[PDB]
Amino acid sequence: NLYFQGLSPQVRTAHIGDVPVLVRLMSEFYQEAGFALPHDAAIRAFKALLGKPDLGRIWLIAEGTESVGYIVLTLGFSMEYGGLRGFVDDFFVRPNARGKGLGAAALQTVKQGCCDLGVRALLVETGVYSRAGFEESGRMLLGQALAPPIHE
Amino acid sequence: NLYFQGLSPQVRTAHIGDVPVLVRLMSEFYQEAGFALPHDAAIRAFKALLGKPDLGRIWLIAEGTESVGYIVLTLGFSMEYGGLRGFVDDFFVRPNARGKGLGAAALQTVKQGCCDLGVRALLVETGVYSRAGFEESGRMLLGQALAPPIHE
Numbered sequence: 213n214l215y216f217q218g219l220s221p222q223v224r225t226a227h228i229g230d231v232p233v234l235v236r237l238m239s240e241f242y243q244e245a246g247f248a249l250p251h252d253a254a255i256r257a258f259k260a261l262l263g264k265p266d267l268g269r270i271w272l273i274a275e276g277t278e279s280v281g282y283i284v285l286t287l288g289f290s291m292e293y294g295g296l297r298g299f300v301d302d303f304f305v306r307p308n309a310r311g312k313g314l315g316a317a318a319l320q321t322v323k324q325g326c327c328d329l330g331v332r333a334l335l336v337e338t339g340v341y342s343r344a345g346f347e348e349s350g351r352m353l354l355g356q357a358l359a360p361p362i363h364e
Numbered sequence: 365n366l367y368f369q370g371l372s373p374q375v376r377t378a379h380i381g382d383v384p385v386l387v388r389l390m391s392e393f394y395q396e397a398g399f400a401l402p403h404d405a406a407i408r409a410f411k412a413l414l415g416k417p418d419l420g421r422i423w424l425i426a427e428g429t430e431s432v433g434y435i436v437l438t439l440g441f442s443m444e445y446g447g448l449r450g451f452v453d454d455f456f457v458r459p460n461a462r463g464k465g466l467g468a469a470a471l472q473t474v475k476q477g478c479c480d481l482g483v484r485a486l487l488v489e490t491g492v493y494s495r496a497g498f499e500e501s502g503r504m505l506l507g508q509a510l511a512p513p514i515h516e
């Protein structure tokens with residue numbers, strides 16, 4: 213199939229004016245998991261990231277006249293690669309918009325963005341991912357919170 | 365035991381002049397794993413990180429007149445926390461200097477550094493970690509390389 217027939221044009225860069233829609237989408241994403249998302253905290257986070265491109269990038273996933281999803285890339289240095297690595301830090305497609313290939317398109321867009329930026333690797337914390345070239349790393353992830361998460 | 369009797373003063377911030385020692389230590393770290401580390405790539409990586417504090421921080425672990433280890437903190441945005449999270453990105457103590465509590469001191473220093481910076485969480489990819497408050501996150505990590513790692 214040809215480019216215009218596919219879903220790549222449906223994934224677009226997000227701007228400051230998109231914050232209200234991004235907040236709604238993140239709120240839906242959180243509600244689906246049974247969490248309440250404070251609107252101030254969400255606004256703060258999206259504005260912080262949009263205000264400093266060095267931190268990463270956000271794309272919205274469009275269908276008709278609506279954004280029906282979004283994906284967030286965050287960036288950090290990696291000694292293993294001697295350069296930046298990226299994370300698919302958050303990724304949401306509305307339930308009604310799933311199973312249409314939008315998620316796959318979003319991941320391809322982020323991967324292309326990474327290559328364009330000279331990003332050396334792309335990771336995600338967790339089907340759609342496997343087909344996008346994400347495979348299990350085999351590394352045990354440890355952590356500790358130093359502050360409450362955003363939904364608190 | 366009192367502060368001066370402990371190992372916290374043994375963990376110090378690294379500067380540009382430390383690059384030759386950092387490269388040797390990273391080379392030892394890599395050789396222990398059976399890898400050869402290109403010296404140009406190592407120099408490039410340490411200089412990049414030391415040149416841009418927004419990317420993270422490096423500490424050296426001192427014993428007598430020698431650095432016997434180092435630890436690297438890298439920083440990235442996290443939507444989950446609505447702020448920066450940190451990674452213990454690399455961590456090496458020379459074999460002869462292990463089992464003396466130096467690793468524990470290094471991790472405490474990084475954790476304090478994170479709190480001072482308003483970093484919201486601290487993660488590590490993988491005993492010493494457990495006692496430093498790192499516990500299994502339960503999240504499967506997926507990834508794909510977009511470029512060769514530093515030892516290639």
Ligand SMILES: [Mg+2]
Nearest residue numbers: 301302443444
């Ligand atoms: Mg999340």
Ligand SMILES: [Mg+2]
Nearest residue numbers: 291292453454
């Ligand atoms: Mg490493």
